[PDB]
Coordinates of N, CA and C and ligand atoms in Angstrom, one line a residue:
Chain A
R1 N -1.3 -5.0 -22.0 CA -0.6 -3.9 -21.4 C 0.9 -3.8 -21.9
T2 N 1.6 -2.9 -21.4 CA 2.7 -2.3 -22.1 C 4.1 -2.6 -21.5
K3 N 5.0 -3.0 -22.4 CA 6.4 -3.2 -21.9 C 7.2 -1.9 -22.0
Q4 N 8.3 -1.8 -21.2 CA 9.2 -0.7 -21.4 C 9.9 -0.8 -22.7
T5 N 10.3 0.3 -23.3 CA 11.0 0.3 -24.5 C 12.5 -0.2 -24.4
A6 N 12.8 -1.2 -25.2 CA 14.1 -1.8 -25.2 C 15.0 -0.8 -25.9
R7 N 16.3 -0.7 -25.5 CA 17.3 0.1 -26.2 C 18.5 -0.8 -26.4
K8 N 18.9 -1.0 -27.6 CA 19.9 -2.0 -28.0 C 21.3 -1.4 -27.9
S9 N 22.2 -2.4 -28.0 CA 23.7 -2.1 -28.0 C 24.2 -1.5 -26.7
Chain B
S1 N -13.1 -14.9 -28.1 CA -11.8 -15.2 -28.5 C -10.7 -14.7 -27.5
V2 N -9.6 -15.4 -27.5 CA -8.5 -14.9 -26.7 C -7.2 -14.7 -27.5
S3 N -6.6 -13.5 -27.5 CA -5.5 -13.2 -28.3 C -4.2 -13.9 -27.8
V4 N -3.4 -14.4 -28.8 CA -2.1 -15.0 -28.4 C -1.0 -14.3 -29.1
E5 N -0.1 -13.6 -28.4 CA 1.0 -12.8 -28.9 C 2.3 -13.5 -28.5
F6 N 3.3 -13.2 -29.3 CA 4.6 -13.8 -29.0 C 5.8 -12.9 -28.8
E7 N 6.8 -13.4 -28.2 CA 8.1 -12.7 -28.1 C 9.2 -13.7 -28.6
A8 N 10.3 -13.1 -29.1 CA 11.4 -13.9 -29.7 C 12.7 -13.5 -29.2
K9 N 13.6 -14.5 -29.1 CA 15.0 -14.2 -28.5 C 15.9 -13.9 -29.7
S10 N 16.6 -12.7 -29.6 CA 17.6 -12.3 -30.6 C 18.9 -13.0 -30.4
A11 N 19.5 -13.4 -31.6 CA 20.9 -14.0 -31.5 C 21.9 -13.0 -31.3
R12 N 21.6 -11.7 -31.5 CA 22.5 -10.6 -31.3 C 22.9 -10.4 -29.8
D13 N 21.9 -10.5 -28.9 CA 22.1 -10.2 -27.5 C 21.5 -11.1 -26.5
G14 N 20.7 -12.1 -27.0 CA 20.1 -13.0 -26.1 C 18.9 -12.5 -25.3
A15 N 18.5 -11.3 -25.7 CA 17.3 -10.6 -25.0 C 16.1 -11.0 -25.8
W16 N 14.9 -10.9 -25.1 CA 13.6 -11.2 -25.7 C 12.9 -9.9 -26.2
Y17 N 12.3 -10.0 -27.3 CA 11.6 -8.8 -27.9 C 10.2 -9.2 -28.4
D18 N 9.2 -8.3 -28.3 CA 7.9 -8.6 -28.8 C 8.0 -8.8 -30.4
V19 N 7.2 -9.7 -30.9 CA 7.1 -9.9 -32.3 C 5.9 -9.2 -32.9
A20 N 6.1 -8.4 -33.9 CA 5.1 -7.7 -34.6 C 4.5 -8.5 -35.7
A21 N 5.3 -9.3 -36.4 CA 4.9 -10.1 -37.5 C 5.8 -11.3 -37.8
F22 N 5.2 -12.4 -38.3 CA 6.0 -13.5 -38.8 C 6.0 -13.5 -40.3
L23 N 7.2 -13.3 -40.9 CA 7.3 -12.9 -42.4 C 7.5 -14.1 -43.3
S24 N 8.2 -15.2 -42.8 CA 8.5 -16.3 -43.7 C 9.0 -17.5 -42.8
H25 N 9.1 -18.6 -43.4 CA 9.5 -19.8 -42.7 C 10.6 -20.6 -43.5
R26 N 11.4 -21.3 -42.8 CA 12.3 -22.2 -43.5 C 12.5 -23.5 -42.7
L27 N 12.7 -24.6 -43.5 CA 12.8 -25.9 -42.9 C 14.1 -26.6 -43.2
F28 N 14.5 -27.4 -42.3 CA 15.8 -28.2 -42.4 C 15.5 -29.7 -42.3
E29 N 16.3 -30.5 -42.9 CA 16.2 -31.9 -42.8 C 16.5 -32.4 -41.4
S30 N 17.4 -31.6 -40.7 CA 17.8 -31.9 -39.4 C 16.7 -31.5 -38.4
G31 N 15.7 -30.7 -38.8 CA 14.6 -30.3 -37.9 C 14.7 -28.8 -37.5
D32 N 14.0 -28.5 -36.4 CA 14.0 -27.2 -35.8 C 13.7 -26.1 -36.9
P33 N 12.4 -25.9 -37.2 CA 12.0 -24.9 -38.2 C 12.4 -23.5 -37.7
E34 N 12.7 -22.6 -38.7 CA 13.0 -21.2 -38.3 C 11.9 -20.3 -38.9
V35 N 11.7 -19.2 -38.3 CA 10.7 -18.2 -38.7 C 11.4 -16.8 -38.8
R36 N 11.1 -16.1 -39.9 CA 11.6 -14.7 -40.0 C 10.7 -13.7 -39.3
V37 N 11.3 -13.0 -38.4 CA 10.5 -12.1 -37.5 C 10.9 -10.6 -37.7
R38 N 9.8 -9.9 -37.8 CA 9.8 -8.4 -37.6 C 9.5 -8.1 -36.2
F39 N 10.4 -7.4 -35.5 CA 10.3 -7.0 -34.1 C 9.4 -5.8 -33.9
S40 N 8.6 -5.8 -32.9 CA 7.7 -4.6 -32.6 C 8.6 -3.4 -32.3
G41 N 8.3 -2.3 -33.1 CA 9.0 -1.1 -32.9 C 10.4 -1.0 -33.4
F42 N 10.8 -1.8 -34.3 CA 12.2 -1.8 -34.8 C 12.4 -1.8 -36.3
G43 N 11.5 -2.3 -37.1 CA 11.5 -2.2 -38.5 C 12.5 -3.2 -39.2
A44 N 12.5 -3.1 -40.5 CA 13.1 -4.2 -41.4 C 14.6 -4.5 -41.1
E45 N 15.4 -3.6 -40.8 CA 16.8 -3.8 -40.7 C 17.1 -4.7 -39.5
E46 N 16.2 -4.8 -38.5 CA 16.4 -5.6 -37.3 C 15.8 -7.0 -37.5
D47 N 15.3 -7.3 -38.7 CA 14.6 -8.6 -38.9 C 15.5 -9.8 -38.7
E48 N 15.0 -10.9 -38.1 CA 15.9 -12.0 -37.8 C 15.2 -13.4 -38.1
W49 N 16.0 -14.3 -38.5 CA 15.6 -15.7 -38.5 C 15.7 -16.3 -37.1
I50 N 14.6 -16.9 -36.6 CA 14.5 -17.3 -35.2 C 14.1 -18.8 -35.1
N51 N 14.8 -19.6 -34.3 CA 14.4 -20.9 -34.0 C 13.1 -20.9 -33.3
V52 N 12.1 -21.6 -34.0 CA 10.7 -21.5 -33.4 C 10.6 -22.2 -32.1
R53 N 11.1 -23.4 -32.0 CA 10.9 -24.2 -30.8 C 11.7 -23.6 -29.6
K54 N 12.9 -23.1 -29.9 CA 13.8 -22.7 -28.8 C 13.7 -21.2 -28.4
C55 N 13.3 -20.4 -29.4 CA 13.4 -18.9 -29.2 C 12.2 -18.1 -29.6
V56 N 11.1 -18.8 -29.7 CA 9.8 -18.1 -29.8 C 8.9 -18.6 -28.7
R57 N 8.2 -17.7 -28.0 CA 7.3 -18.1 -26.9 C 6.2 -17.1 -26.7
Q58 N 5.1 -17.6 -26.1 CA 4.0 -16.7 -25.8 C 4.5 -15.5 -24.9
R59 N 4.1 -14.3 -25.2 CA 4.6 -13.1 -24.6 C 4.5 -13.1 -23.1
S60 N 5.5 -12.6 -22.5 CA 5.5 -12.3 -21.0 C 4.7 -11.1 -20.7
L61 N 4.1 -11.1 -19.5 CA 3.1 -10.1 -19.1 C 3.7 -9.1 -18.1
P62 N 3.8 -7.8 -18.5 CA 4.2 -6.8 -17.5 C 3.1 -6.7 -16.4
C63 N 3.6 -6.6 -15.2 CA 2.7 -6.9 -14.0 C 1.9 -5.7 -13.6
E64 N 0.6 -6.1 -13.4 CA -0.3 -5.2 -12.6 C 0.1 -5.1 -11.2
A65 N -0.2 -4.0 -10.5 CA 0.2 -3.8 -9.1 C -0.2 -4.9 -8.2
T66 N -1.4 -5.5 -8.4 CA -1.9 -6.5 -7.5 C -1.3 -7.9 -7.8
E67 N -0.6 -8.0 -8.9 CA -0.1 -9.3 -9.4 C 1.2 -9.7 -8.9
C68 N 1.8 -8.9 -8.0 CA 3.0 -9.2 -7.3 C 3.0 -10.5 -6.5
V69 N 1.7 -10.9 -6.2 CA 1.6 -12.1 -5.4 C 1.8 -13.4 -6.3
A70 N 1.8 -13.2 -7.6 CA 2.0 -14.3 -8.5 C 3.5 -14.3 -9.0
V71 N 4.3 -13.5 -8.4 CA 5.8 -13.5 -8.6 C 6.4 -14.2 -7.4
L72 N 6.9 -15.4 -7.6 CA 7.4 -16.2 -6.5 C 8.9 -16.6 -6.6
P73 N 9.6 -16.7 -5.5 CA 10.9 -17.3 -5.5 C 10.9 -18.6 -6.3
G74 N 11.9 -18.8 -7.2 CA 12.0 -20.0 -8.0 C 11.5 -19.8 -9.4
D75 N 10.7 -18.8 -9.6 CA 10.1 -18.5 -10.9 C 11.1 -18.0 -11.9
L76 N 11.0 -18.4 -13.2 CA 11.5 -17.7 -14.3 C 10.6 -16.5 -14.6
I77 N 11.2 -15.3 -14.8 CA 10.5 -14.1 -15.2 C 11.3 -13.5 -16.4
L78 N 10.6 -12.5 -17.0 CA 11.3 -11.7 -18.0 C 11.6 -10.3 -17.4
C79 N 12.8 -10.0 -17.2 CA 13.2 -8.8 -16.3 C 13.9 -7.7 -17.1
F80 N 13.5 -6.5 -16.9 CA 14.1 -5.4 -17.6 C 15.5 -5.0 -17.0
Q81 N 16.5 -5.3 -17.7 CA 17.9 -5.0 -17.2 C 18.3 -3.6 -17.9
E82 N 18.2 -2.6 -17.0 CA 18.4 -1.2 -17.5 C 19.8 -0.7 -17.1
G83 N 20.6 -0.6 -18.1 CA 21.9 -0.1 -18.0 C 22.1 1.2 -18.6
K84 N 23.3 1.7 -18.7 CA 23.5 3.1 -19.2 C 23.6 3.0 -20.8
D85 N 24.3 2.0 -21.3 CA 24.4 1.9 -22.7 C 23.4 1.0 -23.4
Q86 N 22.6 0.3 -22.6 CA 21.5 -0.5 -23.1 C 20.5 -0.9 -22.0
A87 N 19.2 -1.1 -22.5 CA 18.2 -1.5 -21.6 C 17.3 -2.6 -22.2
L88 N 17.4 -3.8 -21.8 CA 16.8 -4.9 -22.5 C 16.1 -5.9 -21.6
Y89 N 15.1 -6.7 -22.1 CA 14.5 -7.7 -21.3 C 15.2 -9.0 -21.4
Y90 N 15.6 -9.5 -20.2 CA 16.3 -10.8 -20.1 C 15.6 -11.8 -19.2
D91 N 15.7 -13.1 -19.5 CA 15.3 -14.1 -18.6 C 16.0 -14.0 -17.2
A92 N 15.3 -14.1 -16.1 CA 15.9 -14.1 -14.8 C 15.2 -15.1 -13.9
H93 N 15.8 -15.5 -12.8 CA 15.0 -16.2 -11.8 C 14.9 -15.4 -10.5
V94 N 13.7 -15.5 -9.9 CA 13.5 -14.8 -8.6 C 14.1 -15.6 -7.5
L95 N 15.0 -15.0 -6.7 CA 15.7 -15.6 -5.6 C 15.0 -15.3 -4.3
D96 N 14.4 -14.1 -4.2 CA 13.8 -13.7 -2.9 C 12.9 -12.5 -3.2
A97 N 11.9 -12.3 -2.3 CA 10.9 -11.2 -2.5 C 10.7 -10.5 -1.1
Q98 N 10.8 -9.2 -1.2 CA 10.5 -8.4 0.0 C 9.2 -7.8 -0.2
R99 N 8.1 -8.3 0.4 CA 6.8 -7.8 0.2 C 6.4 -6.8 1.2
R100 N 5.9 -5.6 0.7 CA 5.6 -4.5 1.5 C 4.2 -4.0 1.1
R101 N 3.5 -3.4 2.1 CA 2.1 -2.9 1.9 C 2.1 -1.9 0.8
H102 N 1.1 -1.9 -0.1 CA 1.0 -1.0 -1.2 C 0.5 0.3 -0.8
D103 N 0.7 1.4 -1.6 CA 0.2 2.7 -1.4 C -0.4 3.3 -2.6
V104 N -0.6 4.6 -2.6 CA -1.2 5.3 -3.7 C -0.6 5.0 -5.1
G105 N 0.7 4.7 -5.1 CA 1.4 4.5 -6.3 C 1.4 3.0 -6.7
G106 N 0.8 2.2 -5.9 CA 0.7 0.7 -6.2 C 1.7 -0.1 -5.4
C107 N 2.3 -1.1 -6.1 CA 3.1 -2.1 -5.5 C 4.4 -1.6 -5.0
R108 N 4.8 -1.9 -3.8 CA 6.1 -1.4 -3.2 C 7.0 -2.6 -2.9
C109 N 6.6 -3.8 -3.4 CA 7.4 -5.0 -3.2 C 8.7 -4.9 -3.9
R110 N 9.7 -5.6 -3.5 CA 11.0 -5.7 -4.2 C 11.4 -7.1 -4.4
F111 N 12.1 -7.4 -5.5 CA 12.5 -8.8 -5.9 C 14.0 -8.9 -6.1
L112 N 14.6 -9.8 -5.5 CA 16.0 -10.1 -5.8 C 16.0 -11.1 -6.9
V113 N 16.6 -10.8 -8.0 CA 16.6 -11.6 -9.2 C 18.0 -11.9 -9.7
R114 N 18.2 -13.0 -10.4 CA 19.4 -13.5 -10.9 C 19.2 -13.7 -12.4
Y115 N 19.9 -12.9 -13.3 CA 19.7 -13.1 -14.7 C 20.3 -14.4 -15.2
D116 N 19.6 -15.1 -16.0 CA 20.0 -16.4 -16.5 C 21.3 -16.4 -17.3
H117 N 21.5 -15.3 -18.1 CA 22.5 -15.3 -19.2 C 23.9 -15.0 -18.6
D118 N 24.0 -14.2 -17.5 CA 25.3 -13.8 -17.0 C 25.4 -14.0 -15.5
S119 N 24.4 -14.6 -14.8 CA 24.4 -14.9 -13.4 C 24.5 -13.6 -12.5
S120 N 24.3 -12.4 -13.1 CA 24.4 -11.2 -12.3 C 23.1 -11.1 -11.5
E121 N 23.2 -10.3 -10.4 CA 22.0 -10.2 -9.6 C 21.6 -8.8 -9.4
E122 N 20.3 -8.5 -9.2 CA 19.8 -7.2 -9.0 C 18.5 -7.2 -8.2
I123 N 18.3 -6.1 -7.4 CA 17.0 -5.9 -6.7 C 16.2 -5.0 -7.6
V124 N 15.0 -5.5 -8.0 CA 14.1 -4.7 -8.9 C 12.7 -4.6 -8.4
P125 N 12.0 -3.5 -8.8 CA 10.6 -3.2 -8.5 C 9.7 -4.0 -9.4
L126 N 8.5 -4.1 -9.1 CA 7.5 -4.9 -10.0 C 7.4 -4.3 -11.4
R127 N 7.6 -3.0 -11.5 CA 7.5 -2.4 -12.9 C 8.5 -2.9 -13.9
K128 N 9.6 -3.6 -13.4 CA 10.6 -4.2 -14.3 C 10.3 -5.7 -14.6
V129 N 9.3 -6.2 -14.0 CA 9.0 -7.7 -14.0 C 7.9 -8.0 -15.0
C130 N 8.1 -8.9 -15.9 CA 7.1 -9.5 -16.7 C 6.9 -11.0 -16.3
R131 N 5.6 -11.3 -16.0 CA 5.2 -12.7 -15.7 C 5.1 -13.6 -16.9
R132 N 5.5 -14.8 -16.8 CA 5.1 -15.8 -17.8 C 3.6 -16.1 -17.8
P133 N 3.0 -16.2 -18.9 CA 1.5 -16.1 -19.0 C 0.8 -17.2 -18.2
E134 N 1.5 -18.4 -18.0 CA 0.9 -19.5 -17.3 C 0.6 -19.1 -15.8
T135 N 1.3 -18.1 -15.3 CA 1.1 -17.7 -13.9 C -0.3 -17.1 -13.7
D136 N -1.0 -16.8 -14.9 CA -2.4 -16.4 -14.8 C -3.2 -17.4 -14.0
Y137 N -2.8 -18.7 -14.1 CA -3.4 -19.8 -13.3 C -3.4 -19.5 -11.8
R138 N -2.3 -19.0 -11.3 CA -2.2 -18.7 -9.9 C -3.3 -17.7 -9.6
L139 N -3.3 -16.6 -10.4 CA -4.2 -15.5 -10.1 C -5.7 -16.1 -10.1
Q140 N -5.9 -17.0 -11.1 CA -7.3 -17.5 -11.2 C -7.6 -18.2 -9.9
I141 N -6.7 -19.0 -9.4 CA -6.9 -19.8 -8.2 C -7.3 -18.8 -7.1
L142 N -6.5 -17.7 -7.0 CA -6.7 -16.7 -6.0 C -8.0 -16.1 -6.1
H143 N -8.4 -15.9 -7.4 CA -9.7 -15.2 -7.7 C -10.9 -16.0 -7.1
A144 N -10.7 -17.4 -7.2 CA -11.7 -18.3 -6.7 C -11.9 -18.3 -5.2
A145 N -10.9 -17.7 -4.5 CA -10.9 -17.7 -3.1 C -11.8 -16.6 -2.5
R146 N -12.1 -15.6 -3.4 CA -12.9 -14.5 -3.0 C -14.3 -14.8 -2.5
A147 N -15.0 -13.8 -1.9 CA -16.4 -14.0 -1.5 C -17.3 -13.8 -2.7
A148 N -18.3 -14.7 -2.8 CA -19.3 -14.7 -3.9 C -20.1 -13.4 -3.9
Ligands
ZN1 ZN1 3.5 -5.8 -4.3

């Protein structure tokens, strides 16, 4: 199953 | 067969990211092998050398609605810290759980968590929580309690 999309910086 | 997938901790931010591929290895006389990692959904420019023993581990599991019972005070979890300028998965410990009856949308429980890297605290829903895979054990135990 699926993780949330990481957004860096 | 059972698949085994990994996540790796970045030296840039101390957050954990899914690993898409292991590209190369390097060894030191002092020990602690390092592996070159391509991160899932990021591409070559984000590639990193990662300490295998310290910063690579079996992937944390985003929770199914029924699996909130396997999230306990005292646990390390991988928690989505969603800010305005960034949103990243960080290690955290569960301090307290407010368990509420589920509805059409699934789990309504809430968890007070404390992030390991900055000691900041947050109340989060289950959709931001990833279980360490060994907690499958708990669920298995629970599964054995059912009626045949
Ligand atoms: Zn719940």
